[PDB]
Enzyme design. Structure first.
Site, PDB file in Angstrom:
ATOM      1  N   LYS A 108       0.915  -1.187  -0.059  1.00 33.52           N
ATOM      2  CA  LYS A 108       0.065  -0.018  -0.049  1.00 33.52           C
ATOM      3  C   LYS A 108       0.789   1.258   0.064  1.00 33.52           C
ATOM      4  O   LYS A 108       1.053   1.871  -1.065  1.00 33.52           O
ATOM      5  CB  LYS A 108      -0.938   0.011   1.124  1.00 33.52           C
ATOM      6  N   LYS A 148       7.213  -3.633   8.433  1.00 36.36           N
ATOM      7  CA  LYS A 148       6.277  -2.703   7.522  1.00 36.36           C
ATOM      8  C   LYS A 148       6.483  -1.331   7.646  1.00 36.36           C
ATOM      9  O   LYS A 148       6.421  -0.639   8.524  1.00 36.36           O
ATOM     10  CB  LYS A 148       4.862  -2.986   8.115  1.00 36.36           C
ATOM     11  N   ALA A 176       5.361 -14.524   9.059  1.00 38.15           N
ATOM     12  CA  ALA A 176       4.817 -15.738   8.461  1.00 38.15           C
ATOM     13  C   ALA A 176       5.762 -16.507   7.520  1.00 38.15           C
ATOM     14  O   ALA A 176       5.473 -15.876   6.346  1.00 38.15           O
ATOM     15  CB  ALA A 176       3.126 -15.515   8.194  1.00 38.15           C
ATOM     16  N   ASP A 186     -12.887  -6.367   5.752  1.00 39.52           N
ATOM     17  CA  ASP A 186     -12.461  -7.012   4.433  1.00 39.52           C
ATOM     18  C   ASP A 186     -11.294  -7.758   4.457  1.00 39.52           C
ATOM     19  O   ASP A 186     -10.195  -7.487   5.063  1.00 39.52           O
ATOM     20  CB  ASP A 186     -12.354  -5.829   3.420  1.00 39.52           C
ATOM     21  N   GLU A 238      -4.640 -12.120  -0.075  1.00 42.06           N
ATOM     22  CA  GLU A 238      -3.511 -11.192   0.152  1.00 42.06           C
ATOM     23  C   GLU A 238      -3.096 -10.892   1.420  1.00 42.06           C
ATOM     24  O   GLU A 238      -1.961 -10.689   1.699  1.00 42.06           O
ATOM     25  CB  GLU A 238      -3.582  -9.991  -0.913  1.00 42.06           C
ATOM     26  N   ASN A 239      -3.946 -10.584   2.327  1.00 44.22           N
ATOM     27  CA  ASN A 239      -3.952 -10.373   3.611  1.00 44.22           C
ATOM     28  C   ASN A 239      -3.936 -11.769   4.526  1.00 44.22           C
ATOM     29  O   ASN A 239      -3.786 -11.485   5.539  1.00 44.22           O
ATOM     30  CB  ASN A 239      -4.666  -9.365   4.187  1.00 44.22           C
ATOM     31  N   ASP A 270      -3.202  -7.138   9.086  1.00 50.99           N
ATOM     32  CA  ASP A 270      -4.031  -5.746   8.980  1.00 50.99           C
ATOM     33  C   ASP A 270      -5.294  -5.970   9.481  1.00 50.99           C
ATOM     34  O   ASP A 270      -6.455  -6.149   8.902  1.00 50.99           O
ATOM     35  CB  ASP A 270      -4.142  -5.492   7.623  1.00 50.99           C
TER      36      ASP A 270
HETATM   37  C1  LIG Z   1       1.878  -3.850   2.846  1.00 48.29           C
HETATM   38  C2  LIG Z   1       1.593  -5.207   3.383  1.00 48.29           C
HETATM   39  O1  LIG Z   1       1.024  -5.306   4.155  1.00 48.29           O
HETATM   40  N1  LIG Z   1       2.607  -6.285   2.977  1.00 48.29           N
HETATM   41  C3  LIG Z   1       2.302  -7.774   3.452  1.00 48.29           C
HETATM   42  C4  LIG Z   1       1.817  -8.627   2.678  1.00 48.29           C
HETATM   43  C5  LIG Z   1       2.227  -9.788   3.382  1.00 48.29           C
HETATM   44  N2  LIG Z   1       3.366  -9.756   4.394  1.00 48.29           N
HETATM   45  C6  LIG Z   1       3.903 -10.269   5.308  1.00 48.29           C
HETATM   46  C7  LIG Z   1       4.083 -10.096   6.718  1.00 48.29           C
HETATM   47 CL1  LIG Z   1       3.239  -8.670   7.210  1.00 48.29          CL
HETATM   48  C8  LIG Z   1       4.818 -10.860   7.685  1.00 48.29           C
HETATM   49  N3  LIG Z   1       5.458 -12.279   7.083  1.00 48.29           N
HETATM   50  C9  LIG Z   1       5.290 -12.575   5.703  1.00 48.29           C
HETATM   51  N4  LIG Z   1       6.000 -13.529   4.897  1.00 48.29           N
HETATM   52  C10 LIG Z   1       5.670 -13.280   3.634  1.00 48.29           C
HETATM   53  C11 LIG Z   1       5.898 -14.164   2.406  1.00 48.29           C
HETATM   54  C12 LIG Z   1       5.639 -13.995   1.223  1.00 48.29           C
HETATM   55  N5  LIG Z   1       6.071 -14.688   0.524  1.00 48.29           N
HETATM   56  C13 LIG Z   1       6.018 -15.101  -1.030  1.00 48.29           C
HETATM   57  N6  LIG Z   1       7.012 -15.812   1.303  1.00 48.29           N
HETATM   58  C14 LIG Z   1       6.842 -15.304   2.603  1.00 48.29           C
HETATM   59  C15 LIG Z   1       7.507 -15.832   3.756  1.00 48.29           C
HETATM   60  N7  LIG Z   1       4.870 -12.171   3.657  1.00 48.29           N
HETATM   61  C16 LIG Z   1       4.728 -11.799   4.651  1.00 48.29           C
HETATM   62  C17 LIG Z   1       3.771  -8.183   3.960  1.00 48.29           C
END
Ligand SMILES: CC(=O)N[C@H]1CCN(c2c(Cl)cnc3[nH]c(-c4cn(C)nc4C)nc23)C1
Length: 246
Positions: free
Chosen positions: A18, A37, A88, A131, A135-136, A149
């Site tokens: 975002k 973040k 995660a 929502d 993606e979240n 979120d």
């Molecule tokens: C703007 C925003 O909220 N971005 C968020 C999306 C998911 N994210 C993650 C957040 Cl907040 C925490 N841990 C994550 N791990 C991953 C991940 C993605 N892939 C392809 N492999 C791994 C491991 N993503 C996250 C960041």
């Protein structure tokens, strides 16, 4: 109790998102792995989402649930705002969906079962984020779901401008369950305007491979009138859930 950016080693990027990216990070003193973040105050201020954000932030901070991404802390410098989140390791559910094309009833029901729990906790705690996109939705070490979120996941009452309550969550579960089983959200269109019309009319069809046990739950979840949507407890008690959950 606060920090700085000097206490972290920044790793690879995790997502664009975002108002700024998310980096894999590591707390220098404790060697704690986490997601960091980053959000720009200026880019935040242009949409004015500062009160809503810090309001959202303060609440999540105290939330404690397996199916919700933990928020450990936060801080700012001059141009940006930093969020210290649970990392995660297995990524988003959307990517897994992209890789697997679609989910079997076993995985789907298990996911829905995990979500329904989280929202119940979220409801009892009187927090609302309405929502939920794949993606979240994130995955833990045990493959467990993690809530973190945009029209496709909105209920009719929201896009119509009518009043809404806790029943909007049931709609989300309906959209997600369908998407998990089919690989596309029910009201997907090649046009914003067309998606809108289909959400308000509840125009959707089931592919042949969808079982009537799943059709039932989905049909009962995707009701236009919120009052006619079941309670969360009913979802967990649904025979198709019980039969296929884990
Ligand atoms: C703007 C925003 O909220 N971005 C968020 C999306 C998911 N994210 C993650 C957040 Cl907040 C925490 N841990 C994550 N791990 C991953 C991940 C993605 N892939 C392809 N492999 C791994 C491991 N993503 C996250 C960041």
């Amino acid at each position: 109790r606060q920090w700085a950016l000097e206490d972290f080693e920044i790793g690879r990027p995790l997502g664009k998102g975002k108002f700024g990216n998310v980096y894999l990070a590591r707390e220098k003193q404790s060697k704690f792995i986490l997601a960091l973040k980053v959000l720009f105050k200026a880019q935040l201020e242009k949409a004015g989402v500062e009160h809503q954000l810090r309001r959202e932030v303060e609440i999540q901070s105290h939330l404690r649930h397996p199916n919700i991404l933990r928020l450990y802390g936060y801080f700012h410098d001059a141009t940006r705002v930093y969020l210290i989140l649970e990392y995660a390791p297995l990524g988003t559910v959307y990517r897994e969906l992209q890789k697997l094309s679609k989910f079997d009833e076993q995985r789907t029901a298990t996911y829905i079962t995990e979500l329904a729990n989280a929202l119940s906790y979220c409801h009892s705690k009187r927090v609302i984020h309405r929502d939920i996109k794949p993606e979240n939705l994130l995955l833990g070490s045990a493959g467990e779901l993690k809530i973190a979120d945009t029209l496709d996941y909105l209920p009719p009452e929201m896009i119509e401008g009518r009043m809404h309550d806790e029943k909007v969550d049931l709609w989300s579960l309906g959209v997600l369950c369908y998407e998990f089983l089919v690989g596309k959200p029910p009201f997907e269109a090649n046009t914003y305007q067309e998606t809108y019309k289909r959400i308000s009319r509840v125009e959707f069809t089931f592919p042949d491979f969808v079982t009537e046990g799943a059709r039932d739950l989905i049909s009962r979840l995707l009701k236009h009138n919120p009052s006619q949507r079941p309670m969360l407890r009913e979802v967990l008690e649904h025979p198709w859930i019980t039969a296929n959950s884990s």
